[PDB]
């Protein structure tokens, strides 16, 4: 008969074979990152390679089927998933070389460490050690030492790896009919043949710039404010007309600046919105954090969790012998086994992260109504945005009012409003030019607009142009400040979180749209409003059943990425920023340097 | 625990209590092929039952008790002591 009936039979075979094998692979990787031993990491690439080669096995068994035969959009977007050869298509030495450089970066980034120059026993890795000094030390020389050292120890040693990686990976992307590897990145957002719901690869560049022009004034005033408070916290170090030094950014490079908050607080004698003291003093544990997150999911209109969730997850750190990695992720194992990997301390950041990862698990259970190749994100933006929704509403004072913290006769002046909004705004505003600059840098490198001897020079020029951040000590091309980060050497897409930051406030206004909230978005709580979670659950039950613009219309009614809700979230704070920065310098100069002072 | 499987490949539905067994290789157009052939697959495959499956993939033993209706008289299960009086009856 026809090819599409036997294609249905083939996809039946492939799903009911592949779910069990990927479940075994994800359990093996899970019981490595929860039981770190040799047998467990060799399990991580036993059923892991048994899955990775199975992709190419059923790709070749699916690339027999010609692509231009398909009428059903379901098996169309399925065949576009199987027929994608991925990183398996190179000349035979280059594929294993590319896999070698990937795992080599993934090892020496994670186990590389810096050391005290006069005594080589005082050594610290990235996590912990260096992420605490960049976030909590108040010393120029200490932060600048860790700053220079993390780029000198591993970044120089990650520089030739990324140097061969750009040629190998751009060659692979040209081998899969893409322009560069940035084009391979933007091809995830790209969709084909949807007629009014299409999306091209250059449209991502156009839209990210089209909203980054809509981030520049807010970031201009916020960068002026945090520049003034970093001058006041670090005297004789920072010029009023210059940028920020890259070691005083709260972290190592400039992604999250919320650790400036204790020195960039607006009003330090009003009660702080961070309920960390209320969590530790009133004695809840991590299990109470996650159960209160689940009851928030019941309040917003969503059902409870699976048995594999509360039975087989590792929500906390065991500490000793059964040691586990502590990065909060939501692993999607299938078979109803959707878990949160986390080392949860008694922390409001961990509270919002509990809502966040359980938002991921909620989106996983929502697209669980599919078969497995539609059991994923539509794009690389919906998963993390549905995560950050529950945290952002859960950050609001109306949430902390109705949880059991924040003793209920709490004041709602403009004082603590500007405090909380600027606390949010450090993170949300400062993550945007760093994202645009990092992805624009890597797109320029993967295209080849930045030469092989100008990665580090044009790197600092983009740090000054976009983020407005200078280096305190300069760098030649021996260093590599992108590749010494988690996102560049370990091959993580990073514009996905930019799109997240847009979809975050979009979905936040659509969930506060039907919830009938009185004030603006920043006091809005979707708890006790079933229509908010049901409105996220109508778009959430798609998964990769549709292209992402149709689901974007299914939240707000639009086709394109927009930041107007973030404008409605930050605009009273934005005018407050403009009134506080009428006596602070408006702009940054690309000539200033703490070594050139 | 992979000692329980199922069929997802058949040329139509089942008649009343036709117990399909067959270990005959499936292809949707007749045509008994030879696996690993093209579009001539295996009809029987696994379940994937783990105890680490939560609520979602629990293995359930199902007993179906066909209560047939008086084609023959009473077999399934259904002392009245009265003498010298006119009462209604049923015996075995």
Summarize the structure.
The structure is cut from a larger assembly and holds chains A (597 residues) and B (92 residues). Chain A is built from 24 helices and 6 strands. With 597 residues, chain A is mainly alpha-helical.
Walk me through the structure.
It is classed as viral protein/hydrolase. The structure is cut from a larger assembly and holds chains A (597 residues) and B (92 residues). Chain A is mainly alpha-helical. Chain A has one domain (1-597). In chain A, 55% of the residues lie in helices and 4% in strands. By secondary structure, chain B is largely without helices or strands. Chain B is built from no helices and two strands. Chain B has strands spanning 6-7, 44-45. Chain B has a two-stranded antiparallel ribbon with strand order 1-2. Chain B starts with 5 loop residues before the first strand and ends in a 47-residue tail after the last strand. The chains are: A mainly alpha (597), B little secondary structure (92).
Outline the fold blueprint.
The structure is cut from a larger assembly and holds chains A (597 residues) and B (92 residues).
Chain A: H1 3-33, H2 38-44, H3 46-60, H4 73-82, H5 92-108, E1 113-115, E2 123-125, H6 126-136, H7 140-153, H8 155-175, H9 181-189, H10 202-212, H11 216-233, E3 244-245, H12 261-264, H13 276-281, H14 286-299, H15 307-312, E4 329-334, E5 337-341, H16 348-366, H17 382-395, H18 397-403, H19 414-447, H20 455-467, E6 469-470, H21 496-511, H22 530-540, H23 548-553, H24 564-580
Parallel strand pairs in A: 3-6
Antiparallel strand pairs in A: 1-2, 4-5
Helix pairs in contact in A: 1-2, 1-3, 5-8, 6-7, 8-9, 11-19, 11-24, 14-16, 16-17, 17-21, 19-20, 19-24, 21-24
Chain B: E1 6-7, E2 44-45
Antiparallel strand pairs in B: 1-2
PDB class: viral protein/hydrolase
Keywords: spike, membrane fusion, viral protein
Entry title: Trypsin-cleaved and low pH-treated SARS-CoV spike glycoprotein and ACE2 complex, ACE2-bound conformation 1
